[PDB]
């Protein structure tokens, strides 16, 4: 029997809000280490890696490893049924055919309990630049550049980070410079200059995880796909991997 109880239950809601638009069905790895997910998107161009460590949960028990095939949209709806301040418990048997979601109330007078059905889905350091910026600012830049073109050139040097886009109506570039504050500051760790090109649609998909964290981390290098990382509040992390265009 697997049982995970988490007081801050909004975290799950936010995670699936970030994921429902990217992956339709996915296999959750349930272990003594926590809740994990590794998957491609429906268009097979990007990679999503979600980690929620067991220590971050209020109660955690995982007798056997579980490979829960889940339709992320259905689970997102069911989590929509939960209140933002509810306590969320995920429960499964060793033969995980049903998943149980328990939503607890303030004065223990409302107790929602939903049961999903799981499917038989088999589960399947080089970096020159690291930018830490506000998650809202990254989402804003992605949304803004979406109007200009389909591909974004991210340039990273010791002077700042630039997001450029070109398309039918013209071009456009945004320049973020490091600040003096140093979750509202922009910080650049550049060990080698970097100039790469990525699909803006997938970046806008990644930015759906903005409510999970106030800061986003863009880890960039010429030979590896970009990593967009959102750190949760003292729990796991959501990492998106997107290959640079040739």
Numbering used by the authors: 1 to 124, 131 to 188, 192 to 255
What are the paper's exact sentences on this?
pmcProliferating cell nuclear antigen (PCNA) is a sliding clamp protein that acts as a molecular “hub” for chromosomal DNA replication, repair, and maintenance.
We found that overall the structure of PCNA-C148S is similar to that of PCNA-WT with an RMSD value of 0.85 Å, indicating no significant global changes to the structure. Furthermore, the conformation of residues surrounding C148S does not differ significantly from PCNA-WT. Although the S228I variant has a deformed partner binding cleft, this region is not obviously altered in PCNA-C148S. From a structural point, the C148 residue is buried in a hydrophobic pocket near the interface between subunits and participates in a π-sulfur interaction with F144. These types of interactions have been shown to confer substantial protein stability. We found that all three PCNA variants display unfolding curves consistent with a two-state unfolding mechanism. Both PCNA-C148S and -S228I have dramatically reduced thermal stability compared with PCNA-WT (PCNA-WT Tm: 52.0 ± 0.03 °C, PCNA-C148S Tm: 42.0 ± 0.06 °C, and PCNA-S228I Tm: 44.0 ± 0.1 °C). Our combined structural and affinity binding studies indicate that, in contrast to PCNA-S228I, PCNA-C148S does not exhibit the defect in partner binding that was thought to drive PARD.
